[PDB]
Scaffold this active site. Structure first.
Site, short mmCIF file in Angstrom:
data_model
loop_
_atom_site.label_atom_id
_atom_site.label_comp_id
_atom_site.label_asym_id
_atom_site.label_seq_id
_atom_site.Cartn_x
_atom_site.Cartn_y
_atom_site.Cartn_z
N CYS A 54 28.01 -0.55 16.98
CA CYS A 54 26.56 -1.29 16.91
C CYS A 54 27.00 -2.69 17.27
O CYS A 54 26.32 -3.71 18.30
CB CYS A 54 26.23 -1.83 16.57
SG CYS A 54 25.53 -0.38 14.94
N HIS A 58 16.13 -1.62 18.35
CA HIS A 58 18.01 -1.67 18.55
C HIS A 58 18.43 -1.40 19.39
O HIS A 58 18.82 0.77 18.52
CB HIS A 58 18.77 -1.35 16.88
CG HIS A 58 19.97 -1.72 17.06
ND1 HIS A 58 20.50 -2.19 17.59
CD2 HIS A 58 20.95 -0.98 15.42
CE1 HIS A 58 22.28 -2.14 16.40
NE2 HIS A 58 21.83 -1.69 16.39
N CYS A 116 26.70 -6.23 12.29
CA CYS A 116 27.02 -5.14 11.59
C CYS A 116 27.86 -3.82 12.25
O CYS A 116 27.42 -4.11 13.51
CB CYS A 116 26.74 -4.65 10.68
SG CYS A 116 25.18 -4.17 10.79
N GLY A 174 28.76 0.43 12.88
CA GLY A 174 28.61 1.25 11.71
C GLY A 174 31.00 1.76 11.94
O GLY A 174 31.28 1.52 12.89
N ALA A 190 31.29 -10.96 14.84
CA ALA A 190 30.51 -12.35 15.38
C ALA A 190 31.25 -13.62 16.94
O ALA A 190 32.68 -13.69 16.77
CB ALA A 190 30.99 -13.67 13.82
#
Ligand code: K
Ligand code: K
Ligand code: K
Ligand code: K
Ligand code: K
Ligand code: K
Lengths: 394, 392, 392, 394
Positions: free
Chosen positions: C89, C348, C378, C380, C386
């Site tokens: 992701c 998404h 987040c 998978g 970040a």
């Protein structure tokens, strides 16, 4: 004093014919046969338990519905005693089913048989030939079962190419083909509007995801088919050819069913049959010109039943391609005014397993509507076969 | 019209095991050499054949109309037409019956009829490929596994056998007894040469060589009671039907030449056998294995035989349990039934078997110098079929 | 070497819904127009681009190396190389980070970086086709459904969300509250024209026409609390995660132009933003949704910010429940987070999203005249990533 | 005073290379990476928890093993803190993984990175492109993912055709190609027999259905490859061509992994590294002659590290095709006695995702065996890229 029973027909019904990806897109062959089997028996003067056998012609059989005939009999709610079997003789499958029913009745093997044909081309699967033991390396082919069944299995040419062979052999013009094509749609549309098919058609209810659709009218005939539109189509099988999508039959979905019994059984029941079968015939020809099959089949059959061609009041000769029909017309010197009088495969569609039974249903009803007696139904068969059925309306 | 039907040839391929000798052979390819040999033995030239009728369970659209395609591939004239029959396990027997009907009515004088199944080469199918799966995983379907699943109830044939087990209170041990017998008698028959005359060898052209397949490969020389008793149930958790007491998945073809007695006399041929009658009965699909019981009873009435009049019977072992239900229901004398083995020991190429057991019965009646035979088998979907013959 | 990294363009396609406007568009095709527009806006000619780096979750062998293939398809010179990144992701955000690393080290002066996902056009796979299935039914696998399933534990991402629900005692009702907010704020932003500048319209050539896709199609104008509360749980029987409070399956691309501050000054360009830091943290895959918590804490230490110093945050809503776990763990001020909606309302497209939220954050910081931003999501497999930026 | 850390390599290991459908037939990329990751860390002077990132180059990624690097890290039993990501830069993927690891270390993003590449070509799936929304009518294609990845995605020609382009451009003969091919097998066989690869190879245990196989030796090299056999092969990509299966690299399976860390971290740990990275470079070229990539990549890199080509003690230039290697050799005027001294892709195989890391592993060990310092590893990349890595053995 061994006896051979006369065979009579007490009901003759069909679904409307769907277009490819059309109203019957999501219907399997068993699902499509069921309501027609049910209505046939209801009209045929017998209860389900009195039916000795269901025989169906089916070109693209499915292993998930093994033995289409037996499966459809059970799915229709018929008793477990009502057995069935399924026949593959390519385009004539549905007619062979009727012939096989007649054989059982003539011999006293069965007293009552429900017979016809079905094809659900829209819902037919794709196949993988190398999935079991492996493709190993390089790209493979995922095969359309509909497209396979249209290809000759020996010569690997499409039925449309065999049609072009007949074009060349019989010197058939693009105009001739397109005239027959326009006629096919025009006469079908007229018959539909006039209500000629109202009695013979059994509406099919399709349970879709969020609604139910009631399909009650043939959907292949097109009001927008004109001489102009046909002349503008590109050749489909040969460069500089003349066979097109417009003058060829379609890919279609449909079922058609007759109830047959011995004439003695009909008398016992106090039933007035619609028609009797007086003969049938099968002839083998060169697969490369399979479309000519009806010529020797009809000639062979006329000899057997002692009719002249001229004696026939109406004929149904399936239009697999207009060109193929034209070759038969030229070979037999047919009177077109007596042939396919409410259209045929080009206008109405060609659900292949079904068609041999479908044209018989249509013939029976049109003979009766016109008050005429003698009918011939005949069609060509991929692989090089012609089949003909000889009937008398009662 | 109203002719008697005789049989002038009865031959078969050896029966291959799944993924075995015939792994890469198609149904047409497997039918062709047996068609050719049958006609050669049957006293006719190919042009004299009026129809080829084949029973075939898993038909292929790349070989549309298996019978006609095989006739052409075998080099038979264009005049030799054909059609293909699906009545599940009894398909090959129905082909023989349909041939008989044509001959009785004078529709045909000479018919070549039988059955074929090439299970090893059968394809996989995708049902959502045409219009799309859209989202989530789909199934790629094994056509062999599909054809073994009842299409109304969605249970495997093996589960319908477990239904008979419960109904007839059939022990695991008696099933395994029958399974052992099937292999044992088959092996003895093979060793004694009983099948030599009826078997047509098949040549398979492999990548670097040709292979000649001439012997049935399913029977297991070293099968034992101990081995069978150790196997796990295949269809139910606390069940008794196993891979060892069930018929196999197999490949094979079998073909008869039939004609009118009149035609045989006209050709000066001495037939192997005559057909005296045939019958079909419908039963509950959930216990399809019992089909032969009503079919045999129905046929016996028609031909005016008692069960005891039969010298030999072939009752296909789809599963030992299914055979046992039939044996119990009809109170058969096991010593006259499947005397050289059956489906468990020899294999079950489904389209083929109804014809295969008829071929075998004809030759064994002759070998023993016996007259009356019954061949019968159960049919997925709940059908029983029976054929009554007299060796000549 | 040791350069600061600035961003001179930040653009994206509108986000399509599954089977929607971009149904028939491939990842390269969807990346191309956004690559072209980004470079046009970013103050450079294509020949000045040193590398294209794209994050892509469901890569295709018919478009090998999505980044290089898209660079070429976009008409960029052969000298413009590329590579493609899979960090689930966060792929699109990792592409931006990798670009920054190259620029910081002087490996590249100008990098075009972002992400793409074309979920609607993703293929199906057969795993047993090469060597054979042999017998019984197989699975035809949806690559989209595969990529949503944890490869170690074999549970769907939605189930990992239910694990966070249980861990953080998150109500169905708060999930639906967040879902409603996501649509509501997205719709308001769309109506107000907030996205006008950042969106690159996509032209799709259909059979008889061309379509111009210019607006995000996932937000639902008529979504309500009542509708959300009525939905069935999607991943667990007594569960709270639903289709309505989960992100969608979507299609989209997003691209930034990055260069050294030195290069921007040399070109006289006024950048939109600078990158101040970035961080990656690994967590239990069974609760992969919590990843942003340790990633943000780790990054804040590195850039010497307090959480409160951040003016705006983008924390992708993979599932409302997953976002809520992060909000609770970090004690975020919701009024500064996902202020124009997030994954539930906007969609998404997984490879794309890490870049998409960065594009959105940059433009919203500028719109509000604010400086400090954090983008985080987040992944998978149990990862949090970040990115810390300052609008210029 | 911002610092850029020197990057050193403390372990370098690989699986043996399997042939297509060979020993690693039934192994997935994650399965193939796991034991090599494990052994690398064991040799590399760090515990798993000290690893900051795993970076793997992988050409044919699988959605059932999403993010091969992270998945393999977890499957290897490494702590949840050990993150990973996966790189696709075609044939150079495994080398880019090492470069990306070096970048993280130089910047202080990571202190310890495990990096390399993997390809499991034998177990790669087939794909259907029209299954989701439907094929509708006619036959479709089931696509081999291996065969797709070998086809240029813009021009739709196979890598072998791009090789023939170089044959024509550089006037490379069939004999030259076959001499290189024979050399590749011969030198590989010799290295294997001499035990040169013993230290670097990690045996893979394959759990098959009824046994376990321990795969410990490269299986592509062939003793039966002779000048005679090579000359008899048919051209594979062009009629009257010269590129054949014998002078092209194979389709292969393998993994290869390095442990990298800052030089300061190695000093902290008291570790003697195997080698240091001194530079790396990437160059884009015409995809139609992608095989020439190493020329500009090497030239660009030499300028950066201030080496002459002559300064290099050994080179590994992957042989994707003998012809492709020959074009690079001619363009750079290389001394073949210093290049691919224990064979290359033609003899040893080409597991594409793996190879960029594999040749680096091999180079490091051979420099050390010969007591030499300076190495260049470089390879061409489908899509038109060259990548080069410059190292010094310690
Ligand atoms: K009627
Ligand atoms: K014989
Ligand atoms: K029949
Ligand atoms: K911009
Ligand atoms: K990177
Ligand atoms: K080492």
């Amino acid at each position: 004093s061994n006896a051979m029973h006369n065979v009579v027909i007490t009901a003759a019904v069909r679904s409307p014919i769907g277009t490819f990806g059309g109203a019957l897109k999501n219907v399997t062959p068993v699902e499509l046969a069921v309501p027609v089997l049910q209505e046939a028996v209801k009209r045929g003067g017998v209860e389900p338990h009195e039916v000795d056998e269901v025989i169906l012609g089916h070109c693209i059989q499915r292993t998930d519905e093994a033995n289409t005939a037996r499966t459809a009999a059970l799915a229709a709610g018929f008793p477990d005693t009502v057995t069935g079997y399924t026949i593959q003789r390519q385009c004539s499958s549905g007619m062979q089913a009727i012939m096989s029913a007649a054989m059982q009745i003539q011999l006293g093997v069965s007293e009552v048989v429900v017979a016809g044909g079905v094809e659900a081309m829209s819902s037919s699967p794709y196949a993988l030939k190398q999935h079991r033991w492996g493709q190993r390396l390089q790209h493979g082919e995922i095969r359309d079962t509909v497209w396979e069944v249209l290809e000759d299995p020996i010569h690997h040419i499409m039925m449309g190419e065999t049609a072009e062979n007949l074009v060349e052999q019989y010197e058939i013009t693009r105009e001739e083909q397109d005239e027959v094509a326009l006629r096919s749609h025009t006469l079908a549309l007229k018959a539909i509007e006039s209500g000629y098919f109202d009695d013979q058609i059994v509406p099919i209810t399709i349970k879709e995801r969020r609604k139910e659709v009631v399909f009650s009218k043939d959907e292949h005939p097109r009001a927008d088919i004109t001489a102009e539109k046909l002349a503008g189509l590109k050749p489909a099988f040969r460069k500089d050819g003349s066979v097109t999508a417009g003058n060829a039959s379609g890919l279609n979905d449909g079922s058609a069913v007759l109830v047959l019994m011995s004439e003695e059984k009909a008398k016992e029941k106090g039933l007035q049959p619609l028609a009797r079968i007086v003969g049938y015939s099968v002839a083998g020809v060169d697969p490369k010109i399979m479309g000519i099959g009806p010529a020797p089949a009809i000639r062979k059959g006329l000899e057997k039943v002692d009719w002249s061609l001229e004696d026939a009041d109406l004929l149904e000769i399936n239009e697999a391609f207009a060109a193929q029909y034209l070759a038969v017309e030229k070979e037999l010197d047919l009177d077109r005014e007596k042939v396919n009088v409410n259209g045929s495969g080009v206008g109405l569609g060609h659900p292949i397993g079904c068609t041999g039974a479908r044209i018989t249903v249509s013939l029976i009803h049109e003979l009766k509507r016109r008050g005429l007696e003698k009918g011939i139904a005949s069609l060509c068969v991929g692989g090089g076969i012609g089949v003909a059925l000889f009937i008398e309306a009662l």
